[PDB]
Design a protein around this ligand. Structure first.
Ligand SMILES: [Mg+2]
Ligand SMILES: [Mg+2]
Ligand SMILES: [Mg+2]
Ligand SMILES: [Mg+2]
Ligand SMILES: [Mg+2]
Ligand SMILES: [Mg+2]
Ligand SMILES: [Mg+2]
Ligand SMILES: [Mg+2]
Ligand SMILES: [Mg+2]
Ligand SMILES: [Mg+2]
Lengths: 177, 136, 51, 76, 116, 94, 60
RNA sequence: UGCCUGGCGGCCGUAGCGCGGUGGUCCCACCUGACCCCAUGCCGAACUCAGAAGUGAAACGCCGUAGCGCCGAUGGUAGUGUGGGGUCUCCCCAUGCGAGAGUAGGGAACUGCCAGGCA
RNA sequence: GAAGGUUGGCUAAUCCUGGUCGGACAUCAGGAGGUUAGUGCAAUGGCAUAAGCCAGCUUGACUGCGAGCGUGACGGCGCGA
RNA sequence: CGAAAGCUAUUUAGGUAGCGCCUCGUGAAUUCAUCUCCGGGGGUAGAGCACUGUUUCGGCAAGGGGGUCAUCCCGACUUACC
C-alpha cells in the first residue's frame, strides 16, 4: 500500500496527540472497505447483476460476491435466495489502493461535487457514502456504459465514536463539507 | 360490556370455583367493594353495578374494576336435544371467590363511597362488604 | 401420490433387483446407484428399470 | 360437529424406573425428542427410545450446564 | 470470538471420546507454542504432557511455533507415553483443523509409536 | 408505646393454627438478628384494635413473652380474606 | 487472493491536467488521463444579495 | 511452599450480567508478513503458514463493588391421603403429608490433575 | 438420489443508526437482542455437541441375522446393541 | 366355590369371537398382599405470570385518525382524540 505508509507515519502520531491515547492500538484504524450494488432489476434480467458485478470488478479489482435476498419480499417480487446485489470486501493493500483511487480520482469526477457529509457516520465511527453514477471512476469506460449504476461505499474502522472516525478520515484529507 | 377483544379458544370447560380469592387488598384507591360470597359475575351485572356507582358519585373521583369476565358461557337453544356438540357462547362471566376486591374508588368521601357501593351491590348476585385500604 | 415405483436391476447378470420410487416428471434421468448384490456378494452398479 | 377425531395413544413414558435391574436391550423410556438424554451404557434410538446397552441398574441424574436429565446404566 | 468458536467446534468430538472411554491425546496450539497432553478417560488426570514451553524441547528448536516444533512435541509426547505403556490413544484436535502444525504433531506421535 | 402480651406456641401446623384462631388467638413469628425465630400466640381482639391505628405499622413495638421485653417492628400481616380479622403477623427484631 | 478469477489488476499511470501523476494499480489495461484530480478541484482546495443587484443597475 | 499463567476436567447462576480498577519477565491476546502448506461461494476477516518489532487498546485473566440476575429460611397460608361431619355448586373437624409466592437473610463461586514463569 | 450417509465449516427473529437509484420492507456496514428464528407439511415433545444453515466426497435408502425389550385379544406393529 | 354387564373386533351394536372376571385339576418360586425403610420418574391439586394468550390502572409514550395554520416540497397546529 501507499496510504498505509501515510497512516503509519503521520496519522497515528497526529491522532495520538489529539486524543490523549495510551497505546498505538487505541488509535482508530481503517479495517475494511465494502462496496455493494443493489441490482434488484436483476428480477427482470439476470444479465443486469452480471453487468453490475463486472462494473464492480472493474472498479475494485477483485471479483464480487453475489448476494441473495435474505427473505421472500412481496414488495419487490423477490424470493428468499434470489440474487439482487453484489459486494466486495477490500482489506489491506487493495483497500488502501482503492482509498487512494477514490479520494484522488473518483470524488473529483462527481457532478456538482461540493464535499461529502460528516453526519454520514453510523454512530460508531463507520462512514458510508453513495455514488449516483459509476463513471466517477476512471476504471469504468464511458463509450460502452450499458446502463447508469451507482454503488454504496462503507468504511468500517476501529474508531469507537463518530468523532474518532471523522478525525481519522480527515487525517487523509477526506473531502468533508 | 366487558369481554375479551379476542381469545385463543371459543369455548371453555365448565370447571369449578373452589378456593379463596387473589387480590384481597384495595390496591389502587382508598375504598373497595369486596366479595364475601362465591359465584359468577356476568358482564351485564358488572356493567349495571358500574353504572350505579358512577351515577351516585356524579362521575367524580376515579373508579377501578378489578374483575374482568374472561370466561365464555355457552347455552343450548330452546327445543334442542342433548348432545350434537357444545352449545353456543351466550355471555361472559368472571369467577369470584370470597375475598375478591370487585371495584375500587378514590377521590370521594368515605360516606359517599359507601352509598355508591351500596347502590352498586344491589345489582350483584353475591354478598359483599365495604373495605378500606390498609397500611399493610 | 405421483412418485412411481421402479426397480434397480443388478449389473452383475444375477437378476437381483431392489425397488424404490421416483419423481419422473422432475428427475427423468435414469437412476444409478452402487448397491450390494447378494447373489455375487459384491457391491456393483445398479440401474433403473421398469417395475 | 367439526370435531370428533383423535389418534391412538402411543404408550410413551418410563418403562423401568430408577434402581431397576435390566438386561441389555431393555427399553428404559419411550419419548418424543430427547426429553431424557442417554448416559453411560445407554443408547438412543431413531425414535429417541433410550435402551440399556449393558446389564445393570437404571440411574436417573441431572448434569451439564443445561441441567438436563440423563439416564445411565450402572453395571452390576 | 475465536476461542469460543473453537471450543464449540471441539465439543462434539470431545463428548464422543468421553462416551467411548478413550484415552485422549489432546493438542493445544497458539501462534507461539504447541502442547500435547495424554488425558485419562475420566477427563481430569494427565498421564503425559509435552510442550514447547518446556526447555528440554525448546532448547533444541529454532522457533517454538512452527511445524518442526510441532513434530518435536509429537515425538516427545509419544515416547513419554510409550515409556508409560499407554500405546493406544484417540486424537483430539481441540477444534483446530487437522492440518499443518497439529497434523505434524499427530504424524510424529504416530511414527514414534502411538496408536491412532 | 404499643405493648403486646404474647405466649410461646406449644404446637405448630395447620390444625394448631386453626385451633388458635377458633379460640380468639392467632399465631405470629418474631425473626431477625442471630437469635432463632420465636413463634408466639397473640390475643386477636387486642392486637386487632391496636393495629387499627397506623402508628402500629411504623413505630417500634414491644412484645412481652413471659416477662421478657422484645422490641420489634411489624413486617407483614396476613389478613382474613373477608372478615375484619388477623391471621398471622411477622415481627422483625429491631 | 484466488487464482484466475480476478480482473487483471496491474499498476497503471494516471496524469492530471495540473501536472499531477499518480502511479496506480487499477483494472483498466491502458493508462489514465483525467481532467480534475484531488489537488485541482474547487472543493478540495476550498474554492466552492438584492441591494447590490438593485444598485448595480441603479447608479442614482 | 506461596503469587501469576496455560491446558483438561469436576460443578452447573451463592458460580451469570452490570459498574470500576488492574496485569505483559513468562504465558495469553491482539500483532507482523504471506508466491508459498492451506483458505475466501469476494476479501490472509476467518481458516492456514512463516515469525516476534509493537501493545495490553480490545479480548482475556484477576481484584473490588449489590444496580440486577441467582440462592433462601422460620412462621403462616393453599392443596391433599385416611376417618368423621355440615348450612353439601362449597366447606369443616381429627390425624398424616404440606406447597407456590413472599419476608428475614445469603451472595461478587468452590475445586482435582498436569505444565510453565517468579518468589 | 438429496431434503439420505459422512467429513469440515456455520448460527437465528426483530429493531435501531449510516448508505445510489431504493420506498414500510431488497442488497451493504455497524450496534442492540439472544432463538422472540428455523424444522419439506398439523400439533406436541425435542433440537447449539445443534435435529437449524453451507460445502466436499458419496449410496448404509446395504444383504443375511439378532441378545434383549416395548406395545397389542389376535393378525400384527415398534425399539435394538 | 362363585362371576360379568368391561377391552378389542365384527353389515357390529339386545348376536358372536379372543382377552378380562368364575370354576375344577396339576405344578412351581419368600410367588403375592398389607406396613416400615430405601431407590425412582412425574407436571395433576395448589401456585404463579418469564413464556403463549387474555386483563385493568399509573408513568413514559413509537405513534397514527380527525381541525388550525402555513402550503410547489415543505413546516408549524390542536386534539373529545385514540
Ligand atoms: Mg387437616
Ligand atoms: Mg494473522
Ligand atoms: Mg485493557
Ligand atoms: Mg417455599
Ligand atoms: Mg463480576
Ligand atoms: Mg457436522
Ligand atoms: Mg442431516
Ligand atoms: Mg363365598
Ligand atoms: Mg340382536
Ligand atoms: Mg389450578
Amino acid at each position: 500500500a501507499k496510504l498505509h505508509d501515510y497512516y503509519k507515519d503521520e496519522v497515528v502520531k497526529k491522532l495520538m496527540t489529539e486524543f490523549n491515547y495510551n497505546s498505538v492500538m487505541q488509535v482508530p484504524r481503517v479495517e475494511k472497505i465494502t462496496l455493494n450494488m443493489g441490482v434488484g432489476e436483476a428480477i427482470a434480467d439476470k444479465k443486469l447483476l452480471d453487468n453490475a458485478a463486472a462494473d464492480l470488478a472493474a472498479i475494485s479489482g477483485q471479483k464480487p460476491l453475489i448476494t441473495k435476498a435474505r427473505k421472500s419480499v412481496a414488495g419487490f417480487k423477490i424470493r428468499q435466495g434470489y440474487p439482487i446485489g453484489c459486494k466486495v470486501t477490500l482489506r489491506g493493500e487493495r483497500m488502501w489502493e482503492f482509498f487512494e483511487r477514490l479520494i484522488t480520482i473518483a470524488v473529483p469526477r462527481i457532478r456538482d461535487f461540493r464535499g461529502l457529509s460528516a453526519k454520514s457516520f453510523d454512530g460508531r465511527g463507520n462512514y458510508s457514502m453513495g455514488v449516483r453514477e459509476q463513471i466517477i471512476f476512471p476504471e469504468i469506460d464511458y463509450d460502452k456504459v450499458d446502463r447508469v449504476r451507482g454503488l454504496d461505499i462503507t468504511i468500517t474502522t476501529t474508531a469507537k465514536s463518530d468523532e474518532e472516525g471523522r478525525a481519522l478520515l480527515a487525517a487523509f484529507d477526506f473531502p468533508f463539507r | 360490556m366487558l369481554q375479551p377483544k379476542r381469545t385463543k379458544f371459543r369455548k371453555m370447560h365448565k370447571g369449578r370455583n373452589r378456593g379463596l380469592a387473589q387480590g384481597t387488598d384495595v390496591s389502587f384507591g382508598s375504598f373497595g367493594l369486596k366479595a364475601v360470597g362465591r359465584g359468577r359475575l356476568t358482564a351485564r351485572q358488572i356493567e349495571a353495578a358500574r353504572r350505579a356507582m358512577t351515577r351516585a358519585v356524579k362521575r367524580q373521583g376515579k373508579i377501578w374494576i378489578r374483575v374482568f369476565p374472561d370466561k365464555p358461557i355457552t347455552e343450548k337453544p330452546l327445543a334442542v336435544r342433548m348432545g350434537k356438540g357444545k352449545g353456543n357462547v351466550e355471555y361472559w362471566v368472571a369467577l369470584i371467590q370470597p375475598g375478591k376486591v370487585l371495584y375500587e374508588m378514590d377521590g370521594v368521601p368515605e360516606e359517599l363511597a359507601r352509598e355508591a357501593f351500596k347502590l352498586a351491590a344491589a345489582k350483584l348476585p353475591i354478598k359483599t362488604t365495604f373495605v378500606t385500604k390498609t397500611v399493610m | 401420490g405421483i412418485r412411481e415405483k421402479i426397480k434397480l436391476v443388478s449389473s452383475a447378470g444375477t437378476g437381483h433387483f431392489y425397488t424404490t420410487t421416483k419423481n419422473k416428471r422432475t428427475k427423468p434421468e435414469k437412476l444409478e446407484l452402487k448397491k450390494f448384490d447378494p447373489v455375487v456378494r459384491q457391491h456393483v452398479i445398479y440401474k433403473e428399470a421398469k417395475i | 360437529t367439526r370435531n370428533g377425531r383423535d389418534s391412538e395413544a402411543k404408550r410413551l413414558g418410563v418403562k423401568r424406573f430408577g434402581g431397576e435391574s435390566v438386561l441389555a436391550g431393555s427399553i428404559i423410556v419411550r419419548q418424543r425428542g430427547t426429553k431424557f438424554h442417554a448416559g453411560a451404557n445407554v443408547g438412543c434410538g431413531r425414535d429417541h427410545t433410550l435402551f440399556a446397552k449393558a446389564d445393570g441398574k437404571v440411574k436417573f441424574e441431572v448434569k451439564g450446564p443445561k441441567n438436563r436429565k440423563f439416564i445411565s446404566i450402572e453395571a452390576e | 470470538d475465536k476461542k469460543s468458536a473453537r471450543i464449540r467446534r471441539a465439543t462434539r468430538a470431545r463428548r464422543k471420546l468421553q462416551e467411548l472411554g478413550a484415552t485422549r491425546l489432546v493438542v493445544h496450539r497458539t501462534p507461539r507454542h504447541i502442547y500435547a497432553q495424554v488425558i485419562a478417560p475420566n477427563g481430569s488426570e494427565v498421564l503425559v504432557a509435552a510442550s514447547t514451553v518446556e526447555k528440554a524441547i525448546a532448547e533444541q528448536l529454532k522457533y517454538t511455533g512452527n511445524k518442526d516444533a510441532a513434530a518435536a512435541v509429537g515425538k516427545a509426547v509419544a515416547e513419554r507415553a510409550l515409556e508409560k505403556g499407554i500405546k493406544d490413544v484417540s486424537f483430539d484436535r481441540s477444534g483446530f483443523q487437522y492440518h499443518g502444525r497439529v497434523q505434524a504433531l499427530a504424524d510424529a506421535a504416530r511414527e514414534a509409536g502411538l496408536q491412532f | 408505646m404499643f405493648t403486646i402480651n404474647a405466649e410461646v406456641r406449644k404446637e405448630q401446623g395447620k390444625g394448631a393454627s386453626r385451633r388458635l384462631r377458633a379460640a380468639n388467638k392467632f399465631p405470629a413469628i418474631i425473626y431477625g438478628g442471630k437469635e432463632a425465630p420465636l413463634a408466639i400466640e397473640l390475643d386477636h381482639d387486642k392486637v386487632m384494635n391496636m393495629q387499627a391505628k397506623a402508628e402500629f405499622y411504623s413505630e417500634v413495638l414491644t412484645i412481652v413473652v413471659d416477662g421478657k421485653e422484645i422490641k420489634v417492628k411489624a413486617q407483614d400481616v396476613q389478613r382474613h380474606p373477608y372478615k375484619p380479622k388477623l391471621q398471622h403477623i411477622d415481627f422483625v427484631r429491631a | 487472493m484466488k487464482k484466475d478469477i480476478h480482473p487483471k489488476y496491474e499498476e497503471i499511470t494516471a496524469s492530471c491536467s495540473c501536472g499531477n501523476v499518480m502511479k496506480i494499480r487499477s483494472t483498466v489495461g491502458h493508462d489514465l488521463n483525467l481532467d480534475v484530480c484531488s489537488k485541482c478541484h474547487p472543493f478540495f482546495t476550498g474554492k466552492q444579495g438584492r441591494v447590490d443587484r438593485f444598485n448595480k443597475r441603479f447608479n442614482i
